[PDB]
Symmetry: D2
Subunit: 185 residues, 4 copies
């Protein structure tokens, strides 16, 4: 009737290390939260004060690459082919970034970003294989945010009386809406 | 060292009955789902085909009172002062109804309903005390839906080219948005 | 196309007050957590040190009535017939108390408590109607805890070598197990 | 103001395929549920009828390898180094199997299995790298189940009066309990 307390002790070695791996991830992603959060807090203004767009974009765009670096400590910190093991840690972060970027470009140049750009722009691989990549589901979900965010924008747009800009946003949203209908539930 | 299996058997009497009380609720609310669900499915059309509004409203408005009746079996089915004990069963239902009604009136007459109306309209008490009532949080949440639904409408509105109706919805949403800012997170 | 911002302002009056009602509940229940938590932390000892039972029971039993008082500020703080509206706040608390009490008595006198006792013991009404009551589902769930806790106890019992006490706990658990089989899933 | 509906159409190609990959997994794991579920349903008997253990073990042990095969369609069905991408599908299944196996051996030979065995026994790699592996967290969690299941067994044991077997289970549980204390919260 025996339990061998080596099977257990020998797992406290693995766990000890896993706690730590999972810790340095938690730590880097902690800054990337922090940075991104402030680009996001700034891009806030477009709802109350149209003039300010330009600068808010400028700032966002600064952060965005101030933290394409962080995605690089993080990058080397993830072992082997084990992205998906941890990917839970940088998914909400990576989504908010896609979203942010996507918003910027739309404000800036009035059209939808490509994954391949957001990729370059964060300094991330376009696919699985060549290294630490940007996951397609994330992209798609960042874009989802965008659409929701623009709806809020079109409505604020009207209350500040930029009636026609509102109408543009709405052409555009309805465009995503059909791009999305082209997919699923 | 004794457990008295009467304390237990005597609770199988209460449980037996509670299962049943909770069952006849579940059953009525099952239809009210069913009915409401179809008003909701019909009012769907306003996004693809503006002409149809009028009829969709007519139908909704039929259902709405086809099931102000159901809220009456349900009404007498709930004992004592125990609304809140079960209220979990008719909360998502009651919310969708507020929402529906609210949408109708806005389409119909272009303004925000009063709780006191939705109340009369479902045949429900305006407050706690005079009997089976319409809960304020529910109302507020039905209205929340509305706002979200109208945003979708303003955007579809533009793709069908009713540019100015779109702009109206947006004045209105922004109106709720300030009514809501007047409250909390 | 009008929203009347009185319908809204007039609800900030109700909400203001509800926040507050819900706040003084949150506050009392905050102590009852605190107290109970310490009886619970003490009754911990029975797993490592059998001698200590007696004192741990003594202490628990002190707390228990040090906070049959709190259930009395709380008591008068809840309006009308609106127990169930808030009952979500004191359910995990009230469960841990039933559990605690139940454990005490079993340790003390080796048998299962009656709801009617836990009731008197916390100074709570035996039913719905005569006032602030002890809810049957809670009781039953406190007892559930008990059974789970005793299983842990029987196993610790054996490692400290009180072989026969272990066997008693097991007669008793198996007794609840049939009391419970007498009910449902 | 343009959305390019190729970026979208080109993703309906990837999604189409992902739905399908994720589908053939869902399908195999559907049987492994089915099989395992029945070994589990049989090993049930040890609580009511001690004689039967031997046969229940025999049966379990049959299933176990009737579905070390399934873990082989599944095996080749998972691409590249993407275990963790899908691993969500076979985690509750793989846990119940570890648990089952672990129970069998304990019943059979009265001691705790090694991961390396459960591995061989399901025909799974001992680590990450040499191929489709058995994840350490899963193992540990299957064992957790075991302990919980044995507690139930020790208590049933006593009601059928095998007093001393009960005491053995309890030495053993308390053994795991210290193996586990040797780890974390």
């Amino acid at each position: 009737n025996f339990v061998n307390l080596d099977i257990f002790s020998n797992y406290q070695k693995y766990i000890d290390n896993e706690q730590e791996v999972r810790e340095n991830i938690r730590i880097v992603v902690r800054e990337i939260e922090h940075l991104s959060k402030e680009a996001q807090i700034k891009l806030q203004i477009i709802h109350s004060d149209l003039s300010q767009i330009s600068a808010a974009c400028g700032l966002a765009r600064k952060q965005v690459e101030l933290c394409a670096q962080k995605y690089q400590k993080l990058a080397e910190l993830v072992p082997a082919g084990q992205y998906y093991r941890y990917s839970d840690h940088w998914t909400f972060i990576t989504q908010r970034l896609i979203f942010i970027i996507a918003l910027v470009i739309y404000l800036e140049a009035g059209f939808l970003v490509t994954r391949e750009t957001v990729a370059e722009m964060l300094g991330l691989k376009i696919s699985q294989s060549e290294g630490f990549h940007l996951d397609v589901e994330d992209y798609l979900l960042g874009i989802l945010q965008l659409a929701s965010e623009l709806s809020r924008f079109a409505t604020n747009s009207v209350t500040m009386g930029d009636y026609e800009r509102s109408l543009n946003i709405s052409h555009f949203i309805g465009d995503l809406n059909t791009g999305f209908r082209l997919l699923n539930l």
